[PDB]
């Protein structure tokens with residue numbers, strides 16, 4: 019049975035923000051999911067600016083439009099989950115009344131879905147006030163609109179929902195599966211989690227937050243096998259890799275960060291880069307570089323020589339196909355789920371890891387497709403500072419002024435199983 | 451002495467449209483010119499939506515902003531004409547009062563410029579009403595605004611200018627050089643044209659219009675020297691070039707065009723393509739293909755052999771450098787000025803010409819830079835239908851279902867005077 023997630027909440031209460039994070043997380047871990055924003059449907063259908071009057075409960079024209087947009091969205095939810103192979107559909111709309119919630123629930127019931135409600139409730143002044151500014155500066159609804167006039171207007175639109183608003187009740191809704199989030203990341207009320215997927219959605223939802231912070235991602239400094247153009251293994255740092263560690267410590271200091279937590283893997287290269295900082299670090303094997311199996315410590319030249327078929331097939335689909343006894347990037351994403359979860363929970367954090375591990379992490383926060391993920395650029399001696407925002411997540415690349423080898427291998431043009439070694443190794447950086 | 455063109459007129463009276471055409475025409479014929487839209491300066495400075503109230507004569511805040519934007523624009527006019535080498539500056543603003551007009555005139559006088567006024571006055575209902583719709587659908591000022599509210603608002607903004615509006619007078623302004631355009635292309639009043647440049651600006655301005663029509667551009671059908679990969683000459687049509695003429699006649703018919711005027715050059719290939727139509731045509735030598743001088747009828751191979759230096763230098767700057775005894779595209783643009791002027795004056799017109807001639811014409815209507823002009827794509831057996839619009843000019847390419855050779859030669863990567871013949875002729879299409 020597919021799952022219908024029904025958002026619930028007043029306008030500008032983080033309902034859409036949560037809808038996006040949840041869709042992204044579920045897709046990242048391989049659960050085909052799509053969100054359906056009723057407001058966007060309205061925008062696409064009307065194509066003209068609408069004042070708060072359009073949202074009044076007695077406004078017969080705006081009432082019909084919002085009602086047909088909502089039905090259009092639900093038809094699409096049905097198409098996705100019953101025809102397109104979707105597993106989870108996120109219905110993003112205010113859904114503030116019991117009547118409405120019971121209709122959607124019956125929609126799910128008629129289509130053989132399990133329904134689960136996610137209500138977002140803000141009460142924190144700063145959160146609420148900032149959300150309106152975020153809505154006023156980023157919503158397509160309020161473009162080229164006077165500041166005060168837009169604010170006042172949206173303010174009146176929220177009122178249109180507030181008067182008949184009924185939060186999920188402890189008794190009235192005791193037979194419904196749901197989670198109520200009070201001020202994103204602060205408090206929660208959970209009721210009747212029906213299955214494994216709802217259990218994981220709850221676990222994820224109960225661990226995200228909006229506390230201002232930055233995620234610092236960087237690979238260990240240049241290693242020994244790095245200079246040799248060799249992949250995997252357990253090398254130590256190289257002269258330049260040591261030179262980096264010292265630039266990293268200074269960087270971390272100049273940054274003057276509030277309670278920075280540092281993580282590394284069980285590999286000497288990360289650990290020794292961490293050992294150069296002032297602050298303590300924690301090491302985990304879940305953060306270890308992707309396993310190259312039989313191709314561990316080889317150069318690409320050597321891979322082309324002993325495993326030309328696997329090498330060409332990996333180039334064809336670098337996300338799914340693996341070396342014998344190795345891991346695929348798809349395997350790595352799954353291994354990295356507890357890391358994803360903890361990075362969400364953390365505040366200011368620095369992760370000294372590896373190239374493949376770092377690509378998976380960058381793909382998560384920057385929302386890159388599974389196809390592009392294995393090809394993301396994670397240069398040595400560079401710190402990728404990620405700062406989660408309302409729209410998504412900004413990224414700043416900070417080169418820490420130390421020379422290093424290039425380990426980035428572009429996908430070669432010829433990926434034929436019957437290709438010449440010169441064409442298979444054409445996109446390799448200098449090595450030895 | 452540089453020239454300051456001062457636009458004058460009510461909002462939505464074609465003032466900006468004329469400002470653009472005039473700047474484009476002057477630049478095309480090689481007179482460095484730039485326009486200065488005071489409304490755009492205001493947009494860039496305020497960066498927030500402004501109602502009609504912002505434009506009220508008693509509104510002390512909007513009065514200061516419009517006044518500093520106007521002075522900023524004039525400072526830039528000064529920088530362009532006195533520091534950047536500009537020849538003509540077009541000051542686009544309502545400039546509806548004598549006081550204002552006299553200030554701008556004194557600005558010109560203090561900076562050693564000759565001032566010339568261009569007033570646009572619409573009275574034709576359909577023109578005026580359509581302009582407001584064009585303004586409402588294309589002005590950045592009215593984005594995401596309610597239709598009726600935007601119209602009403604702009605309507606009130608025009609009122610802000612109408613009450614103190616004083617058109618250029620026959621007696622009051624007898625000492626000023628100017629031209630008053632009443633309903634774009636209908637009537638004109640001209641006073642004291644001071645020099646040659648004002649004389650040409652008047653001549654151009656008195657010949658443009660907004661009567662709905664299309665300009666059909668197409669080269670003669672595939673010729674004999676075309677198949678041989680030979681440039682210039684006076685060949686006749688080839689079997690496919692004849693096959694085209696017949697597709698052209700049918701096209702022109704299926705189009706069912708209102709009083710279509712057809713033009714051709716004094717060359718057999720255009721004339722014979724025209725001879726296949728039902729309608730009469732007129733031939734002019736001003737429409738003759740660019741002169742290749744000593745390289746007439748040669749192939750590129752042959753050019754590389756006898757004139758490798760001129761061939762490499764032409765590839766370096768195809769707009770300005772010419773073959774010995776030949777014309778440059780820059781020479782051709784000038785030769786084509788009477789053609790430009792007449793195409794402006796015409797209504798529905800079809801020009802059966804040549805590749806280089808067609809590039810110059812396409813560059814005019816589509817506003818392409820002099821650098822890009824010699825490289826515009828003008829394929830054989832294809833009709834380029836240009837339709838002048840408010841924003842600029844839309845273009846539709848219509849392939850008339852007849853195979854033909856490719857005569858388009860891209861600029862080769864190596865344009866060194868000391869390059870190998872293989873690298874000079876690398877971008878040549880198949881020929882013989």
Ligand SMILES: CCCCCCCCO[C@@H]1O[C@H](CO)[C@@H](O)[C@H](O)[C@H]1O
Pocket residue numbers: 075081084085088089092112113114115118121122178179180181182183
């Ligand atoms: C699945 C059925 C969806 C029906 C969508 C109805 C659209 C009408 O919009 C209504 O606006 C009211 C504002 O007070 C809210 O309280 C209602 O919950 C909302 O549905």
Ligand SMILES: CCCCCCCCO[C@@H]1O[C@H](CO)[C@@H](O)[C@H](O)[C@H]1O
Pocket residue numbers: 281302304305356357360361369
């Ligand atoms: C990027 C850094 C993220 C590191 C993720 C560490 C995940 C915790 O790893 C382990 O998970 C077990 C699961 O119950 C716990 O019982 C252990 O106490 C914990 O150490």
Ligand SMILES: CCCCCCCCO[C@@H]1O[C@H](CO)[C@@H](O)[C@H](O)[C@H]1O
Pocket residue numbers: 507513516517520521524544545546547550553554610611612613614615
């Ligand atoms: C070169 C001097 C430019 C001065 C710009 C002043 C900007 C004030 O805007 C004024 O709005 C009025 C609306 O009734 C018009 O009549 C004035 O002509 C216009 O200047």
Ligand SMILES: CCCCCCCCO[C@@H]1O[C@H](CO)[C@@H](O)[C@H](O)[C@H]1O
Pocket residue numbers: 713734736737788789792793801
């Ligand atoms: C694209 C077709 C445009 C053709 C432009 C024809 C230009 C007119 O060409 C000639 O110009 C002379 C200039 O005074 C006139 O005296 C002649 O009568 C006219 O034939």
